[PDB]
Amino acid sequence: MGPAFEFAVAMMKRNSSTVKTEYGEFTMLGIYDRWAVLPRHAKPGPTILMNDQEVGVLDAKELVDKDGTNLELTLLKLNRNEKFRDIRGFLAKEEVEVNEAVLAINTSKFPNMYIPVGQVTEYGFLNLGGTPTKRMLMYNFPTRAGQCGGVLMSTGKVLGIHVGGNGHQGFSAALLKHYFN
Amino acid sequence: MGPAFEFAVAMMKRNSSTVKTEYGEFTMLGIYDRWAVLPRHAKPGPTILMNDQEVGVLDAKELVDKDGTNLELTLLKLNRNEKFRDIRGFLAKEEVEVNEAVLAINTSKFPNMYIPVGQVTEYGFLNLGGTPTKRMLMYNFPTRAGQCGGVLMSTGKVLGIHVGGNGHQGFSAALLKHYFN
Ligand SMILES: *[C@@H](CC(=O)OCC)[C@H](C[C@@H]1CCNC1=O)NC(=O)[C@H](Cc1ccccc1)NC(=O)[C@H](COC(C)(C)C)NC(=O)OCc1ccccc1
Numbered sequence A, B: 001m002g003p004a005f006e007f008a009v010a011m012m013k014r015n016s017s018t019v020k021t022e023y024g025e026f027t028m029l030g031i032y033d034r035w036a037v038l039p040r041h042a043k044p045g046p047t048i049l050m051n052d053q054e055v056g057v058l059d060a061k062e063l064v065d066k067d068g069t070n071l072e073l074t075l076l077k078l079n080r081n082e083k084f085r086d087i088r089g090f091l092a093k094e095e096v097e098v099n100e101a102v103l104a105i106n107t108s109k110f111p112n113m114y115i116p117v118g119q120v121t122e123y124g125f126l127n128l129g130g131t132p133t134k135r136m137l138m139y140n141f142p143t144r145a146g147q148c149g150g151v152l153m154s155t156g157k158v159l160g161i162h163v164g165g166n167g168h169q170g171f172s173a174a175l176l177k178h179y180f181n
Protein backbone atom coordinates (compact mmCIF):
# COMPACT_ATOMS: atom_id res chain seq x y z
CA MET A 1 0.00 0.00 0.00
CA GLY A 2 2.83 2.41 1.03
CA PRO A 3 5.26 1.51 -1.75
CA ALA A 4 2.15 1.35 -4.03
CA PHE A 5 1.37 5.05 -3.24
CA GLU A 6 5.02 6.15 -3.71
CA PHE A 7 5.10 4.46 -7.12
CA ALA A 8 1.60 5.84 -7.98
CA VAL A 9 2.61 9.43 -7.21
CA ALA A 10 5.93 9.37 -9.10
CA MET A 11 4.15 7.78 -12.07
CA MET A 12 1.31 10.34 -12.12
CA LYS A 13 3.82 13.18 -12.02
CA ARG A 14 5.82 11.78 -14.94
CA ASN A 15 3.06 10.31 -17.24
CA SER A 16 -0.48 11.59 -16.49
CA SER A 17 -2.36 14.69 -17.55
CA THR A 18 -5.86 16.02 -17.18
CA VAL A 19 -7.93 15.75 -20.36
CA LYS A 20 -11.29 17.13 -21.46
CA THR A 21 -13.30 15.56 -24.32
CA GLU A 22 -16.84 16.65 -25.11
CA TYR A 23 -17.95 13.72 -22.95
CA GLY A 24 -16.19 14.93 -19.80
CA GLU A 25 -13.00 15.32 -17.88
CA PHE A 26 -10.64 12.42 -17.53
CA THR A 27 -7.31 11.34 -16.12
CA MET A 28 -5.03 10.29 -19.02
CA LEU A 29 -1.93 8.13 -18.81
CA GLY A 30 0.55 8.67 -21.61
CA ILE A 31 2.35 5.41 -22.48
CA TYR A 32 5.20 5.90 -24.93
CA ASP A 33 5.91 8.17 -27.89
CA ARG A 34 2.61 10.19 -28.67
CA TRP A 35 0.27 7.34 -27.62
CA ALA A 36 -1.88 7.69 -24.50
CA VAL A 37 -4.99 5.91 -23.24
CA LEU A 38 -8.49 6.99 -22.22
CA PRO A 39 -11.60 4.95 -21.21
CA ARG A 40 -13.55 4.17 -24.42
CA HIS A 41 -16.53 6.12 -23.16
CA ALA A 42 -14.31 9.27 -23.17
CA LYS A 43 -15.06 9.32 -26.90
CA PRO A 44 -12.16 11.59 -27.96
CA GLY A 45 -12.95 13.70 -31.06
CA PRO A 46 -10.47 15.30 -33.50
CA THR A 47 -9.12 17.50 -30.70
CA ILE A 48 -8.93 17.20 -26.90
CA LEU A 49 -7.94 19.57 -24.11
CA MET A 50 -4.76 18.28 -22.46
CA ASN A 51 -3.68 20.27 -19.39
CA ASP A 52 -6.05 23.07 -20.74
CA GLN A 53 -4.52 23.12 -24.19
CA GLU A 54 -5.98 22.01 -27.51
CA VAL A 55 -4.15 18.95 -28.80
CA GLY A 56 -5.10 17.36 -32.14
CA VAL A 57 -5.91 13.63 -32.07
CA LEU A 58 -4.10 12.05 -35.03
CA ASP A 59 -5.58 8.54 -34.49
CA ALA A 60 -7.91 6.90 -31.99
CA LYS A 61 -8.11 3.08 -31.66
CA GLU A 62 -11.14 1.72 -29.83
CA LEU A 63 -9.79 -1.60 -28.50
CA VAL A 64 -11.87 -4.75 -28.93
CA ASP A 65 -10.71 -8.47 -28.60
CA LYS A 66 -10.68 -11.13 -31.40
CA ASP A 67 -14.44 -11.47 -31.18
CA GLY A 68 -15.10 -7.71 -31.25
CA THR A 69 -15.92 -7.62 -27.56
CA ASN A 70 -15.46 -4.18 -25.94
CA LEU A 71 -12.26 -3.70 -23.84
CA GLU A 72 -13.35 -0.09 -22.87
CA LEU A 73 -10.00 1.43 -23.83
CA THR A 74 -9.27 4.00 -26.51
CA LEU A 75 -5.64 4.38 -27.61
CA LEU A 76 -4.87 7.82 -28.94
CA LYS A 77 -1.97 9.27 -30.83
CA LEU A 78 -1.50 12.92 -30.00
CA ASN A 79 -0.50 15.69 -32.34
CA ARG A 80 2.37 16.81 -30.12
CA ASN A 81 6.14 16.99 -30.24
CA GLU A 82 6.88 15.97 -26.63
CA LYS A 83 7.15 12.19 -26.33
CA PHE A 84 5.81 10.41 -23.27
CA ARG A 85 8.25 8.60 -20.96
CA ASP A 86 8.19 4.95 -22.21
CA ILE A 87 6.22 3.07 -19.51
CA ARG A 88 5.40 -0.15 -21.41
CA GLY A 89 7.85 -2.05 -19.14
CA PHE A 90 5.24 -1.35 -16.35
CA LEU A 91 2.39 -2.96 -18.34
CA ALA A 92 1.95 -6.69 -17.94
CA LYS A 93 1.31 -9.17 -20.77
CA GLU A 94 -1.83 -10.36 -19.01
CA GLU A 95 -4.24 -9.05 -16.40
CA VAL A 96 -2.60 -8.35 -13.06
CA GLU A 97 -3.88 -9.46 -9.67
CA VAL A 98 -2.41 -7.72 -6.64
CA ASN A 99 -2.93 -7.62 -2.93
CA GLU A 100 -2.36 -3.84 -2.72
CA ALA A 101 -3.28 -1.34 -5.36
CA VAL A 102 -3.82 2.36 -5.39
CA LEU A 103 -6.11 4.15 -7.79
CA ALA A 104 -4.69 7.50 -8.93
CA ILE A 105 -6.87 10.35 -10.21
CA ASN A 106 -5.89 13.75 -11.49
CA THR A 107 -8.70 16.03 -12.71
CA SER A 108 -10.28 19.41 -11.76
CA LYS A 109 -12.73 17.47 -9.69
CA PHE A 110 -10.19 15.13 -7.99
CA PRO A 111 -6.88 16.90 -8.13
CA ASN A 112 -3.96 14.48 -7.44
CA MET A 113 -6.06 12.14 -5.24
CA TYR A 114 -5.23 8.51 -4.49
CA ILE A 115 -7.45 5.76 -3.21
CA PRO A 116 -6.23 2.64 -1.51
CA VAL A 117 -8.42 0.08 -3.38
CA GLY A 118 -6.75 -3.00 -1.87
CA GLN A 119 -6.83 -6.34 -3.67
CA VAL A 120 -7.30 -6.32 -7.45
CA THR A 121 -8.93 -9.41 -8.94
CA GLU A 122 -9.07 -10.43 -12.55
CA TYR A 123 -12.77 -10.15 -12.97
CA GLY A 124 -12.90 -10.60 -16.75
CA PHE A 125 -16.33 -10.40 -18.35
CA LEU A 126 -18.62 -7.55 -17.18
CA ASN A 127 -21.73 -6.10 -18.79
CA LEU A 128 -20.84 -2.40 -18.23
CA GLY A 129 -23.42 0.34 -19.04
CA GLY A 130 -25.18 -2.19 -21.24
CA THR A 131 -21.94 -3.12 -23.05
CA PRO A 132 -20.51 -6.64 -22.71
CA THR A 133 -16.92 -5.93 -21.76
CA LYS A 134 -13.83 -8.08 -21.08
CA ARG A 135 -10.49 -8.04 -19.24
CA MET A 136 -12.03 -6.17 -16.30
CA LEU A 137 -10.04 -5.85 -13.05
CA MET A 138 -12.23 -5.42 -9.92
CA TYR A 139 -11.45 -3.77 -6.57
CA ASN A 140 -13.65 -2.75 -3.68
CA PHE A 141 -13.90 0.98 -2.81
CA PRO A 142 -16.78 3.45 -3.31
CA THR A 143 -16.54 4.45 -6.98
CA ARG A 144 -17.52 7.91 -8.34
CA ALA A 145 -18.35 9.71 -11.59
CA GLY A 146 -15.32 11.73 -12.73
CA GLN A 147 -12.80 9.02 -11.69
CA CYS A 148 -12.63 7.31 -15.08
CA GLY A 149 -9.23 7.23 -16.54
CA GLY A 150 -7.85 6.90 -13.04
CA VAL A 151 -4.69 4.81 -13.14
CA LEU A 152 -4.71 1.57 -11.18
CA MET A 153 -1.26 0.81 -9.73
CA SER A 154 0.76 -1.29 -7.30
CA THR A 155 4.52 -1.31 -6.63
CA GLY A 156 6.29 -1.58 -9.97
CA LYS A 157 3.07 -2.13 -11.95
CA VAL A 158 0.52 -0.20 -14.00
CA LEU A 159 -2.49 -2.63 -13.90
CA GLY A 160 -5.09 -0.68 -15.91
CA ILE A 161 -7.45 2.30 -16.25
CA HIS A 162 -10.60 2.89 -14.20
CA VAL A 163 -13.61 2.71 -16.50
CA GLY A 164 -16.64 1.94 -14.43
CA GLY A 165 -18.13 1.14 -11.11
CA ASN A 166 -21.29 0.28 -9.22
CA GLY A 167 -21.88 0.72 -5.56
CA HIS A 168 -18.61 -0.09 -3.78
CA GLN A 169 -17.07 -2.12 -6.54
CA GLY A 170 -14.78 -0.43 -9.06
CA PHE A 171 -13.49 -1.70 -12.39
CA SER A 172 -10.42 -1.10 -14.51
CA ALA A 173 -9.76 -2.19 -18.04
CA ALA A 174 -6.50 -4.19 -17.86
CA LEU A 175 -3.78 -2.23 -19.58
CA LEU A 176 -1.74 -4.79 -21.37
CA LYS A 177 1.72 -4.61 -22.88
CA HIS A 178 0.76 -5.86 -26.32
CA TYR A 179 -1.92 -3.12 -26.80
CA PHE A 180 1.13 -1.08 -27.54
CA ASN A 181 2.10 -1.60 -31.21
CA MET B 1 5.09 9.84 1.83
CA GLY B 2 4.67 6.00 1.75
CA PRO B 3 4.73 5.43 5.51
CA ALA B 4 2.63 8.67 5.74
CA PHE B 5 -0.12 7.05 3.57
CA GLU B 6 -0.02 3.74 5.51
CA PHE B 7 -0.45 5.64 8.78
CA ALA B 8 -3.14 7.91 7.21
CA VAL B 9 -5.23 4.96 6.02
CA ALA B 10 -5.07 2.96 9.28
CA MET B 11 -5.96 6.13 11.20
CA MET B 12 -8.93 7.00 8.96
CA LYS B 13 -10.28 3.48 9.32
CA ARG B 14 -10.05 3.56 13.12
CA ASN B 15 -11.01 7.22 13.95
CA SER B 16 -12.79 9.09 11.12
CA SER B 17 -16.41 9.23 10.02
CA THR B 18 -18.41 11.16 7.48
CA VAL B 19 -20.55 13.91 9.02
CA LYS B 20 -23.31 16.15 7.71
CA THR B 21 -24.25 19.45 9.42
CA GLU B 22 -26.69 21.89 7.86
CA TYR B 23 -23.63 23.66 6.47
CA GLY B 24 -22.34 20.67 4.51
CA GLU B 25 -20.60 17.36 4.53
CA PHE B 26 -17.35 16.95 6.38
CA THR B 27 -14.67 14.47 7.33
CA MET B 28 -14.60 14.14 11.15
CA LEU B 29 -11.76 12.80 13.27
CA GLY B 30 -12.83 11.43 16.63
CA ILE B 31 -10.13 12.02 19.26
CA TYR B 32 -10.85 10.28 22.55
CA ASP B 33 -13.95 9.42 24.57
CA ARG B 34 -17.03 11.17 22.85
CA TRP B 35 -15.02 14.21 21.67
CA ALA B 36 -14.38 14.75 17.96
CA VAL B 37 -13.34 17.76 15.88
CA LEU B 38 -14.82 19.62 12.90
CA PRO B 39 -13.72 22.84 11.11
CA ARG B 40 -15.43 25.78 12.88
CA HIS B 41 -17.29 26.69 9.72
CA ALA B 42 -19.03 23.26 9.92
CA LYS B 43 -21.28 24.97 12.47
CA PRO B 44 -22.65 21.81 14.13
CA GLY B 45 -26.19 22.25 15.53
CA PRO B 46 -27.90 20.20 18.28
CA THR B 47 -27.72 17.09 16.08
CA ILE B 48 -25.44 15.93 13.25
CA LEU B 49 -25.51 13.02 10.82
CA MET B 50 -22.58 10.70 11.56
CA ASN B 51 -22.19 7.84 9.07
CA ASP B 52 -25.88 8.63 8.04
CA GLN B 53 -27.21 8.46 11.57
CA GLU B 54 -28.56 11.23 13.79
CA VAL B 55 -26.22 11.83 16.71
CA GLY B 56 -27.04 14.45 19.37
CA VAL B 57 -24.33 17.07 20.04
CA LEU B 58 -24.04 17.41 23.82
CA ASP B 59 -21.49 20.28 23.70
CA ALA B 60 -19.67 22.22 21.00
CA LYS B 61 -16.56 24.32 21.82
CA GLU B 62 -15.54 26.87 19.20
CA LEU B 63 -11.79 27.18 19.87
CA VAL B 64 -10.22 30.63 20.09
CA ASP B 65 -6.74 31.61 21.59
CA LYS B 66 -6.10 33.88 24.65
CA ASP B 67 -6.96 36.95 22.62
CA GLY B 68 -10.18 35.47 21.17
CA THR B 69 -8.59 34.94 17.78
CA ASN B 70 -10.30 32.23 15.66
CA LEU B 71 -8.51 28.81 15.53
CA GLU B 72 -11.21 27.43 13.07
CA LEU B 73 -11.79 24.28 15.11
CA THR B 74 -14.98 23.15 16.83
CA LEU B 75 -14.64 20.44 19.49
CA LEU B 76 -17.79 18.40 19.88
CA LYS B 77 -18.95 15.92 22.45
CA LEU B 78 -21.23 13.34 20.91
CA ASN B 79 -24.31 11.80 22.44
CA ARG B 80 -23.07 8.26 21.83
CA ASN B 81 -22.03 5.24 23.84
CA GLU B 82 -19.10 4.09 21.67
CA LYS B 83 -15.87 5.80 22.74
CA PHE B 84 -13.33 6.87 20.16
CA ARG B 85 -9.89 5.21 20.16
CA ASP B 86 -7.70 7.60 22.24
CA ILE B 87 -5.46 9.33 19.64
CA ARG B 88 -4.19 12.28 21.72
CA GLY B 89 -0.70 10.67 21.78
CA PHE B 90 -0.66 11.48 17.99
CA LEU B 91 -1.38 15.20 18.57
CA ALA B 92 1.62 17.43 19.18
CA LYS B 93 1.87 20.13 21.86
CA GLU B 94 2.69 22.70 19.19
CA GLU B 95 2.23 23.08 15.45
CA VAL B 96 3.97 20.38 13.44
CA GLU B 97 6.19 20.94 10.41
CA VAL B 98 6.89 17.92 8.24
CA ASN B 99 8.58 17.13 4.99
CA GLU B 100 5.91 14.58 3.95
CA ALA B 101 2.26 14.79 4.79
CA VAL B 102 -0.85 13.24 3.39
CA LEU B 103 -4.27 14.82 3.55
CA ALA B 104 -7.03 12.26 4.17
CA ILE B 105 -10.65 12.84 3.17
CA ASN B 106 -13.66 10.64 3.65
CA THR B 107 -17.03 12.01 2.45
CA SER B 108 -19.71 11.14 -0.18
CA LYS B 109 -17.92 13.46 -2.50
CA PHE B 110 -14.35 12.20 -1.80
CA PRO B 111 -14.72 8.69 -0.51
CA ASN B 112 -11.49 7.48 1.21
CA MET B 113 -9.20 9.71 -0.91
CA TYR B 114 -5.67 10.77 0.05
CA ILE B 115 -3.58 13.59 -1.28
CA PRO B 116 0.16 13.79 -1.03
CA VAL B 117 0.47 17.45 0.09
CA GLY B 118 4.24 17.32 0.72
CA GLN B 119 5.89 19.74 3.14
CA VAL B 120 3.74 21.26 5.89
CA THR B 121 4.86 24.66 7.18
CA GLU B 122 3.72 26.43 10.29
CA TYR B 123 2.06 29.32 8.61
CA GLY B 124 0.40 30.83 11.68
CA PHE B 125 -1.73 33.91 11.10
CA LEU B 126 -4.12 33.82 8.09
CA ASN B 127 -7.12 35.98 7.30
CA LEU B 128 -9.45 33.13 6.18
CA GLY B 129 -12.88 33.93 4.63
CA GLY B 130 -12.62 37.36 6.24
CA THR B 131 -11.76 35.87 9.66
CA PRO B 132 -8.35 36.52 11.22
CA THR B 133 -7.22 33.03 12.12
CA LYS B 134 -4.15 31.54 13.86
CA ARG B 135 -2.12 28.32 14.13
CA MET B 136 -2.56 27.63 10.41
CA LEU B 137 -0.46 24.89 8.77
CA MET B 138 0.12 25.41 5.00
CA TYR B 139 0.83 22.88 2.24
CA ASN B 140 0.81 23.17 -1.52
CA PHE B 141 -1.75 21.10 -3.50
CA PRO B 142 -4.90 22.19 -5.37
CA THR B 143 -7.52 22.61 -2.63
CA ARG B 144 -11.28 21.94 -3.12
CA ALA B 145 -14.67 22.63 -1.53
CA GLY B 146 -15.85 19.51 0.33
CA GLN B 147 -12.35 18.66 1.66
CA CYS B 148 -12.72 20.50 4.97
CA GLY B 149 -12.29 18.32 7.93
CA GLY B 150 -9.75 16.33 5.97
CA VAL B 151 -7.10 15.00 8.35
CA LEU B 152 -3.55 16.14 7.78
CA MET B 153 -1.04 13.40 8.66
CA SER B 154 2.55 12.18 8.43
CA THR B 155 4.15 9.03 9.87
CA GLY B 156 3.20 8.82 13.53
CA LYS B 157 1.53 12.26 13.59
CA VAL B 158 -1.90 13.86 13.29
CA LEU B 159 -0.93 17.49 12.40
CA GLY B 160 -4.37 19.11 12.03
CA ILE B 161 -7.67 19.47 10.15
CA HIS B 162 -8.11 21.00 6.69
CA VAL B 163 -10.17 24.17 7.00
CA GLY B 164 -9.49 26.33 4.01
CA GLY B 165 -7.61 26.90 0.84
CA ASN B 166 -7.00 29.26 -2.05
CA GLY B 167 -5.62 28.36 -5.40
CA HIS B 168 -2.98 25.67 -4.86
CA GLN B 169 -2.32 26.41 -1.23
CA GLY B 170 -4.20 24.48 1.45
CA PHE B 171 -4.51 25.17 5.16
CA SER B 172 -5.08 23.09 8.26
CA ALA B 173 -5.85 24.24 11.75
CA ALA B 174 -3.10 22.70 13.92
CA LEU B 175 -4.64 20.04 16.11
CA LEU B 176 -2.89 20.36 19.39
CA LYS B 177 -2.68 18.01 22.34
CA HIS B 178 -3.80 20.50 24.97
CA TYR B 179 -7.10 21.28 23.10
CA PHE B 180 -8.07 18.02 24.65
CA ASN B 181 -9.27 18.67 28.23
C1 LIG C 1 -16.35 7.39 -15.32
C2 LIG C 1 -16.88 8.37 -16.41
C3 LIG C 1 -17.55 9.71 -16.01
O1 LIG C 1 -17.63 10.12 -14.85
O2 LIG C 1 -18.17 10.58 -17.03
C4 LIG C 1 -17.60 11.84 -17.52
C5 LIG C 1 -16.40 12.44 -16.78
C6 LIG C 1 -17.53 6.64 -14.68
C7 LIG C 1 -17.30 6.12 -13.24
C8 LIG C 1 -18.44 5.35 -12.56
C9 LIG C 1 -19.63 6.20 -12.07
C10 LIG C 1 -20.03 5.68 -10.69
N1 LIG C 1 -18.99 4.69 -10.42
C11 LIG C 1 -17.97 4.73 -11.28
O3 LIG C 1 -16.82 4.35 -11.09
N2 LIG C 1 -17.74 5.52 -15.58
C12 LIG C 1 -18.99 5.25 -15.98
O4 LIG C 1 -19.97 5.87 -15.57
C13 LIG C 1 -19.18 4.11 -16.93
C14 LIG C 1 -19.41 4.67 -18.33
C15 LIG C 1 -19.49 3.55 -19.34
C16 LIG C 1 -18.46 2.61 -19.45
C17 LIG C 1 -18.59 1.59 -20.39
C18 LIG C 1 -19.71 1.52 -21.23
C19 LIG C 1 -20.73 2.46 -21.12
C20 LIG C 1 -20.62 3.49 -20.18
N3 LIG C 1 -20.43 3.49 -16.56
C21 LIG C 1 -20.59 2.90 -15.36
O5 LIG C 1 -19.68 2.81 -14.53
C22 LIG C 1 -21.98 2.34 -15.09
C23 LIG C 1 -22.80 3.33 -14.25
O6 LIG C 1 -23.90 2.65 -13.63
C24 LIG C 1 -24.29 3.15 -12.33
C25 LIG C 1 -25.22 2.10 -11.71
C26 LIG C 1 -23.09 3.25 -11.38
C27 LIG C 1 -24.95 4.52 -12.45
N4 LIG C 1 -21.89 1.10 -14.36
C28 LIG C 1 -22.38 -0.04 -14.81
O7 LIG C 1 -23.00 -0.18 -15.87
O8 LIG C 1 -22.14 -1.16 -13.94
C29 LIG C 1 -22.68 -2.44 -14.22
C30 LIG C 1 -22.44 -3.30 -13.01
C31 LIG C 1 -21.18 -3.30 -12.40
C32 LIG C 1 -20.95 -4.10 -11.29
C33 LIG C 1 -21.98 -4.90 -10.78
C34 LIG C 1 -23.23 -4.88 -11.40
C35 LIG C 1 -23.47 -4.08 -12.52
Ligand SMILES: *[C@@H](CC(=O)OCC)[C@H](C[C@@H]1CCNC1=O)NC(=O)[C@H](Cc1ccccc1)NC(=O)[C@H](COC(C)(C)C)NC(=O)OCc1ccccc1
Residues within 6 Å of the ligand: B023, B024, B025, B026, B041, B072, B126, B127, B128, B129, B130, B131, B143, B144, B145, B146, B147, B148, B149, B163, B164, B165, B166, B167, B169, B170, B171
Ligand atom coordinates in the same frame (compact mmCIF):
# COMPACT_ATOMS: atom_id res chain seq x y z
C1 LIG D 1 -14.13 23.45 3.19
C2 LIG D 1 -15.65 23.67 3.48
C3 LIG D 1 -16.72 23.36 2.40
O1 LIG D 1 -16.46 22.85 1.31
O2 LIG D 1 -18.14 23.70 2.61
C4 LIG D 1 -19.20 22.73 2.91
C5 LIG D 1 -18.88 21.23 2.77
C6 LIG D 1 -13.60 24.58 2.29
C7 LIG D 1 -12.36 24.23 1.43
C8 LIG D 1 -11.78 25.34 0.53
C9 LIG D 1 -12.59 25.66 -0.74
C10 LIG D 1 -11.59 25.83 -1.89
N1 LIG D 1 -10.33 25.46 -1.25
C11 LIG D 1 -10.47 24.90 -0.05
O3 LIG D 1 -9.69 24.15 0.52
N2 LIG D 1 -13.26 25.62 3.25
C12 LIG D 1 -13.67 26.87 3.00
O4 LIG D 1 -14.27 27.19 1.97
C13 LIG D 1 -13.34 27.93 4.01
C14 LIG D 1 -14.58 28.24 4.82
C15 LIG D 1 -14.26 29.21 5.93
C16 LIG D 1 -13.23 28.94 6.85
C17 LIG D 1 -12.97 29.88 7.85
C18 LIG D 1 -13.72 31.06 7.95
C19 LIG D 1 -14.74 31.33 7.04
C20 LIG D 1 -15.02 30.39 6.03
N3 LIG D 1 -13.07 29.13 3.25
C21 LIG D 1 -12.03 29.20 2.39
O5 LIG D 1 -11.22 28.28 2.23
C22 LIG D 1 -11.91 30.51 1.63
C23 LIG D 1 -12.52 30.37 0.23
O6 LIG D 1 -12.03 31.41 -0.64
C24 LIG D 1 -11.86 31.04 -2.03
C25 LIG D 1 -11.03 32.14 -2.68
C26 LIG D 1 -11.05 29.75 -2.19
C27 LIG D 1 -13.23 30.86 -2.70
N4 LIG D 1 -10.52 30.88 1.48
C28 LIG D 1 -10.03 32.01 1.93
O7 LIG D 1 -10.68 32.91 2.49
O8 LIG D 1 -8.61 32.16 1.70
C29 LIG D 1 -7.93 33.36 2.04
C30 LIG D 1 -6.54 33.25 1.47
C31 LIG D 1 -5.81 32.08 1.64
C32 LIG D 1 -4.52 31.98 1.13
C33 LIG D 1 -3.97 33.06 0.44
C34 LIG D 1 -4.72 34.22 0.26
C35 LIG D 1 -6.01 34.33 0.78
